Amino acid sequence: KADYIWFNGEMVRWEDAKVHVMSHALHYGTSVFEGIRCYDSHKGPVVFRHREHMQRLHDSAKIYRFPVSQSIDELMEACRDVIRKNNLTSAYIRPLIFVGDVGMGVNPPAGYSTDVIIAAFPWGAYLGAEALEQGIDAMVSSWNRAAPNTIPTAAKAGGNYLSSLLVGSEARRHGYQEGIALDVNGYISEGAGENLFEVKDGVLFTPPFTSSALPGITRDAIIKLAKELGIEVREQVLSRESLYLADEVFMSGTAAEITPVRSVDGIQVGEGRCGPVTKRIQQAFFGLFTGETEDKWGWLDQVN
Amino acid sequence: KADYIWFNGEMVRWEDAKVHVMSHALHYGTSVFEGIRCYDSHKGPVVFRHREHMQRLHDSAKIYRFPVSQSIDELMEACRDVIRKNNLTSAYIRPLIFVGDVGMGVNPPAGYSTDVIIAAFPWGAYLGAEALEQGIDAMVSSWNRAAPNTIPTAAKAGGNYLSSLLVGSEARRHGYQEGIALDVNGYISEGAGENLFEVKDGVLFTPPFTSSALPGITRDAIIKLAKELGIEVREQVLSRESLYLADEVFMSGTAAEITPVRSVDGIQVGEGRCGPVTKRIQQAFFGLFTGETEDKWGWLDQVN
Amino acid sequence: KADYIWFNGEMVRWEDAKVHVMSHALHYGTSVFEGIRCYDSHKGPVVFRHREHMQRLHDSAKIYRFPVSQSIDELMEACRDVIRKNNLTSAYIRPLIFVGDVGMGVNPPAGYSTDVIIAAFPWGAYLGAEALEQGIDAMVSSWNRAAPNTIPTAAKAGGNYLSSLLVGSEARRHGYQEGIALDVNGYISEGAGENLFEVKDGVLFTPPFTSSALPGITRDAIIKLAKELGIEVREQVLSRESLYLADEVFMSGTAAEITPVRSVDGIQVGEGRCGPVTKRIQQAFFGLFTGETEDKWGWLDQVN
Amino acid sequence: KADYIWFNGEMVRWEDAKVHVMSHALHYGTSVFEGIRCYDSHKGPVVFRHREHMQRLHDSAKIYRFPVSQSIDELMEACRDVIRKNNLTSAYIRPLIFVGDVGMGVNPPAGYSTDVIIAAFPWGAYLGAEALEQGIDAMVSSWNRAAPNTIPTAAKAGGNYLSSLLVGSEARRHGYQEGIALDVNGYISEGAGENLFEVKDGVLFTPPFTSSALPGITRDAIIKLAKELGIEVREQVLSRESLYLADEVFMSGTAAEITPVRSVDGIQVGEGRCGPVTKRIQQAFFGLFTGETEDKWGWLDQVN
Amino acid sequence: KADYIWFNGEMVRWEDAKVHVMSHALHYGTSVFEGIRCYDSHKGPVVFRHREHMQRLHDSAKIYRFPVSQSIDELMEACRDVIRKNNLTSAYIRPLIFVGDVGMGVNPPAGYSTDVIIAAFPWGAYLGAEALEQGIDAMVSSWNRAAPNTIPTAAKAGGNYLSSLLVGSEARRHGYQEGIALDVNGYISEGAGENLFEVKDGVLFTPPFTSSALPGITRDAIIKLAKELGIEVREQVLSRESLYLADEVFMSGTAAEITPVRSVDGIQVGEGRCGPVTKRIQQAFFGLFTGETEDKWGWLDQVN
Amino acid sequence: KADYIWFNGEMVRWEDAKVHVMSHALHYGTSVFEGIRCYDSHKGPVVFRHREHMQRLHDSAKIYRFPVSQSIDELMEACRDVIRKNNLTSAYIRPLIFVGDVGMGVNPPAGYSTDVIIAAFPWGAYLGAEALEQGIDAMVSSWNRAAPNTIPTAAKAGGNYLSSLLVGSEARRHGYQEGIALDVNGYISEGAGENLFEVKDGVLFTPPFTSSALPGITRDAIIKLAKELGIEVREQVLSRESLYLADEVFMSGTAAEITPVRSVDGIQVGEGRCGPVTKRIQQAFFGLFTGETEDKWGWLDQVN
Ligand SMILES: *Cc1c(COP(=O)(O)O)cnc(C)c1O
Ligand SMILES: *Cc1c(COP(=O)(O)O)cnc(C)c1O
Ligand SMILES: *Cc1c(COP(=O)(O)O)cnc(C)c1O
Ligand SMILES: *Cc1c(COP(=O)(O)O)cnc(C)c1O
Ligand SMILES: *Cc1c(COP(=O)(O)O)cnc(C)c1O
Ligand SMILES: *Cc1c(COP(=O)(O)O)cnc(C)c1O
Ligand SMILES: CC(C)CCC(=O)O
Ligand SMILES: CC(C)CCC(=O)O
Ligand SMILES: CC(C)CCC(=O)O
Ligand SMILES: CC(C)CCC(=O)O
Ligand SMILES: CC(C)CCC(=O)O
Ligand SMILES: CC(C)CCC(=O)O
């Protein structure tokens, strides 16, 4: 929780950010969202890969043809505003575009417009406080992720999350911290809400987008950092068994950051601790906020 | 629109039926809903297959493990209440169970409870005023319906509708009234929001639930009425070409009722008008509210 | 070979029935055809299920949207004409509608019309003289039949036959008489150019159309005859192994008529001879031309 | 149209290039063909990648086991002959090998031989005169391309085109210039008769042959030219959504040459005009016939 | 354990029934087996559906082309002998045909013969003592059963069980008594080593063999018993969610007999105890050994 | 055959290495094995990639959760011992870990242990004496290899071989030396018991592990050797037709070593003899045992 929320152009007090119960998105999952993080750094509060997330918000809405009034720059300025306004140095930002109080027909009437919301608030490690250091225990779920030409997995839309709910809850019900989903073909897709990486003989592996895996921005950052460290990266389809044969395995995401996976299905991964390559990558990633890692791509956007 | 909405046990003015913008269902599609119809009949206002719809509401919530405080009888009494309170003789009722203002984690915290809403209001023919008589022009969509073990198609959940949105909007964008989706295997599934039936040589055909088709209550009623009329019904997988070789084809649903399909992909179906078997079924269905058709199953629930 | 061929409305001498080498169908497989048989019977020459084949010719062209000038009755009269004209008592008739000398673009220009041809000539048993009595040796091919929503298997079109060529030639190259194809899922579809039936514990089994099997008219006749004989018929998906466990197995088609399969992949079927149920069915089928079997459906069309 | 056509070794007047209506290829799609282009250049008339096309003609025939009497050099000499004989400086050449007047059995009798035809004539831009400059509007088809082990997509055979007909006609029926087909898995295959390329962040992307995409010779030329220009090329499986997120997208083929795609499914691609990378490639391609681009591979075959 | 084992025609003492460690079956899973039960009844010791099991033994070996020296009658006689010789009144019999000490090449040399073994011994309820009365808790496995045309699921061969090991161990590792596997399409196949049945609205449902389910002999008996009791049986494909919506669910097998399933994935089935229809079937089944159920089919084979 | 076999830590005479007929592995395919080769070289008897094979033995058992008492070093020491003890200078070693005489339940009781066996003996070329020089004739099988998430293809387990038996026996039954299997998608997987390679335009191609191909150690060696020779290697999915268009094709495996394939399905590959690239690779491979090829990786383990 925080003080204000940007709602359609104006800062509104948290308690007043309400919407009608007949809002389209509540009944039909018609919304698109993003997960962005603001980190306190050596240059003060900074939003990580800000433009890239806002660009993806526009891309997700474009696929579903949701009209967006605000431009990427407007959304970026609004985001910074929310952080200053709430006096946050570090936080989790949540942009949400949704179809509001329009008719009850599945297809909204021509000429309608969407409601936009940007909320910021402090949020710790998604998979746990000690998760980044010690790693987590994952389980391969019995539920598969969406098939290729059904519900576009490249779009970060609300309705998609019924799948993540099923995958993740099943893992947690059995004592695990997160669940790993396979696609309809039986290959590794990704975790319930985070991308999956494997390390084998010093080489980094990740499933392509065609494995029903969302084009993670953290995923993209890791691939670029790895190339700077001189680590070979291979984007290819991975079998289920590969999880038991890999030297290391970890998950990535905005909320999950970079979490090591110490075991899968009760089978220990390597030494059962955070691996050496995962460590190098974590150090290089968090080094961006200390100044140890040079921001060569302009991933740090100053809030001021 | 109407005057009141049942919200968590009490009648609230329509305009005051608001919910926080950080409600789980707005971000993750975590909601379950129903479509029920109240018809003005020879016995006064009557809710069609009321218990069955409320039973399915509980079933959809059960699959996702959403806790429901209200029993089927409570929900039924609340439904009748909304209709009387709003002075409606005929209307479309919309029960909605959703995960409210709880955390932002995909998996709701233990001990949470859902919010329930029941709204009633007048609503005409989903596919058009003259649709029931003249029929509509459908198009086979380029988007497929959800694969079998991904997002359960037997549950009527909010997030599911991103698919119906894609299928339906594509058809309407090209001049058609509705779109027909095929499953991932290339077989007929159903319309964007209505079951599909075909008539060939006096025999009724419908895809099974395993074709990613939701277990329609109108679909079930039609199969039962058809058997009363002495019409053979075959529940089997159907190829795409069957739509072009069928003597008749129609759609079923609570909102769509029984709508004839006069053409598919520009190819005329039979005579290009409502067929004889579809006619028989329409008369038998609507006859329930006139008294011509005996309600042998107890499908009519008096509102009083 | 015979004397005349019906070509676009007029009887032309066989040798003169030529068409330009730039005819669309030669380059793009754009043609639809039928296989019909005329049998010498107790009522004289009679065409078997004449209207049904002509109706299917129209259906196949309809799916591909090929314009057909002739009506079903015109085509039927033309067919009878060809048989009388050539003095045939028994023969194989071959109706062929194809896209002729039009442009070279894949999609023919609007307003074009198709060329129609009807040729009749004597033709023995497709799988061999002794095949109907002793049976044949079949082999399951390594090539699969067309997937569901790619090239419609319900249409009897020319281009489809590249598949039948592959399936059938492979079997014959290895010493077998015919090849049996599986669909993309690994279930039994049908032979290269004939439907497949299995007999197990007195029950008849056949794959549905959804197994990429063409809706055979001989197949349909057998199903109806079987029901008259009090034989249970089950139209369901069949596994590959079922061919080794079945008591009997046979193929059906216009050209192949009813051919028993004595072995599959070197594994003998039952006694390695024509089975009892297959025999009953053959007797009932050929009995239609002797008068022993009453033509209750009007399958025999007199040529006069 | 032109004056002569090479038919089985000798130049025949166009109007006399006839074949019997009972030719195997008319009924069973048993033919293999090529699309070659002759360009007027700085070195006079020149056939683009002549040997490669004739080599593929032999390869397609080899897969189906069609006997070819003519060697690659004979076919090349005959091709040049047709161009000179018809006084063409620029034209579209169409080599066609087909199973002629042999029996009516699906499998041709042993010892048979095929008929060969080579026709040349002027032909403009396949997708339109202004298509190369302005680009076209494409639509993702509801029909999928052939599954992997059914009808070999690597062979350019006649029967294959029933699929291209379905995909292309559907697009044109809805106001689009061309249709893009997905494979049975739901991934991008290619256009109805042209390969598909996408540009994203300066990188070129194309589906592999395993996506049911024919090994285009223009496709191969573009990949080689791109590498000369220092553009990274990635041959990988592509999701349907990628078409909406791509900076640029274009089609390639002998008849279509290099056509930009300005929109897909009503969604604008980048700027809605020919993109910068597509431009570079177009200039480099057409530069071959001006002398600006050095023919390092020996792609230009002088007709003389 | 017992005193003797029938080994290649002769009664050998249990302790001496050894085979070389280089036996083909030990390295390549090349064996076929059966599970048969001998019950103490009102007619004394009786082997349940003896011939049917031995017939299936021959069928499984036939699929793999393993040569069997003994006829069905000899194997039945041998089975009865082992039961008498070991003084058993009730027991579990295990016939096993395997490729013995032959070469190390995958394909055994021509002219080889198999080794046959028949061991009998007392064996309680597979899923537990109180499992038949109380029911068990099942879990849907993350591992799928063999695809249709890979390793024939209709054959009861040794190598198949690597799959059952994976499915069953996963369930037991999480606190469940048995695991339920889905096929590659995402539909219900069966338990790790027992067929699956569902009861909904008084109707019995079971997946067909094409769902990668072995043709259970107990399954076949239940279907026939149910028809005697006037219970409708439907053999059709079932979705995963159906397990949560079913009134009752139970498993069948020789070793498992008829075990009720009180919960699936933590979701209670009906009342959480053995259901009414399951009970009727159990009573009818076990009634065969008391005389209450008339053996109309000749399922009880006297040992003497 | 040889004199001794290492059995659970002790050298036992060949004839005495027996196990009970009720051993779990005999009935359920519950075993894991390796194929290793000892070559007579310039440094004396040497085991090729010894550690890698023993490492994979542990990996296969780990996937199935079979407990292994011996460490990789103990197994390597045991392997060398057997070779010395049997006075072998060149041989084929066969390590086999299997579930022994434990209960008859599919899941072995907790606390059980496995039996380990290591047998060594002389063994010639798997596909024939002159196969390495002349090449073999292969056939594409009608049986497909295991689907992705069913029975893990990355594990070299006993039960897997029912598939290899079917694929290989079918080829041999038709006059071929080996069969090539496609996966469930219709793409090339590998031979019945050896990996598959293709050479096209001087480039090496091999299917990835996700094509249901086991991670061959010989396959891995060839890829590394090829990179040393400056030959481009591409690990990608391959279509069936690619076998007919390839310049060269060969198989790899411990027992098969490097065997050229001169024809596939009766279609000659290239020149019909061992190709140039295959030859270079063979010479480089066998050169390791002569000293001509430097062992840069430490692949040769001295027996002493
Ligand atoms: C958002 C998301 C991720 C993480 O992506 P980032 O862009 O790295 O935040 C991973 N998986 C799924 C399913 C997601 O929706
Ligand atoms: C609700 C629904 C239907 C219609 O079902 P009824 O129970 O008859 O209202 C059809 N298809 C989908 C996708 C639906 O959600
Ligand atoms: C025509 C055909 C048949 C036979 O059908 P009939 O209508 O019985 O002549 C069977 N299979 C295929 C592939 C066919 O095209
Ligand atoms: C011929 C063809 C192409 C274009 O290939 P080019 O060799 O470049 O002429 C593309 N797609 C299909 C289906 C084709 O047949
Ligand atoms: C043997 C078996 C069964 C049970 O079959 P019964 O003939 O009833 O003993 C069920 N499932 C599998 C996988 C089996 O092997
Ligand atoms: C063992 C095996 C191979 C060969 O692997 P190598 O490690 O090279 O011996 C190939 N295919 C299969 C199916 C195998 O089991
Ligand atoms: C809520 C998360 C599962 C998804 C967005 C993120 O990674 O922040
Ligand atoms: C909007 C509709 C598709 C909802 C279901 C119904 O009420 O029929
Ligand atoms: C030629 C045949 C394979 C097909 C048509 C028929 O059955 O007559
Ligand atoms: C008509 C075209 C699709 C043929 C291929 C080409 O010439 O490009
Ligand atoms: C272990 C069991 C699954 C074997 C088969 C049976 O007896 O039911
Ligand atoms: C029989 C062989 C396929 C076993 C593995 C090998 O040694 O290559």
Rg of chain A, Å, rounded: 19 Å
Helix content of chain A: 25-40%
Q: Using the coordinates shown, work out and report the CATH topology of the largest domain in chain A.
A: D-amino Acid Aminotransferase, Chain A, domain 2
CATH architecture of the largest domain in chain A: Alpha-Beta Barrel
Biggest interchain interface, per-side counts = A-B, 56 and 56 residues
Number of strands of chain A: 18
GO molecular function, one term (chains A, B, C, D, E, F): L-leucine-2-oxoglutarate transaminase activity
Subunit structure (chains A, B, C, D, E, F): Homohexamer.
Keywords (chains A, B, C, D, E, F): Amino-acid biosynthesis, Aminotransferase, Branched-chain amino acid biosynthesis, Pyridoxal phosphate, Transferase
Function (chains A, B, C, D, E, F): Acts on leucine, isoleucine and valine.
Report on the structure:
Six copies of one chain form a homohexamer. With 304 residues, chain A is of the alpha+beta class. Chain A folds into two domains: 1-123 and 294-304, Aminotransferase class 4, branched-chain amino acid transferase, N-terminal domain (D-amino Acid Aminotransferase, Chain A, domain 1); 134-293, Alpha-Beta Barrel (D-amino Acid Aminotransferase, Chain A, domain 2). The first copy, chain A, contains eight helices and 18 strands. Chain A has helices at residues 24-28, 50-64, 72-85, 131-134, 161-173, 217-228, 242-245, 276-286, and strands spanning 4-7, 10-13, 18-20, 31-33, 36-41, 44-48, 91-98, 115-121, 136-140, 178-182, 188-191, 195-200, 203-206, 233-235, 248-253, 257-264, 267-268, 300-302. In chain A, strands 9, 10, 11, 12, 13, 14, 15, 16 and 17 form a nine-stranded mixed β-sheet that branches. In chain A, strands 1, 2, 4, 5, 6, 7, 8 and 18 form an eight-stranded antiparallel β-sheet that branches. In chain A, a hairpin with a 2-residue loop joins strand 1 (4-7) and strand 2 (10-13). The two termini of chain A are 22 Å apart. Bound molecules: pyridoxal-5'-phosphate (PLP) (6 copies) and 4-methyl valeric acid (6 copies). Residues 35, 156, 164, 190, 193-195, 214, 216-219, 252-254 of chain B line the site of one pyridoxal-5'-phosphate. The PDB classes it as transferase.
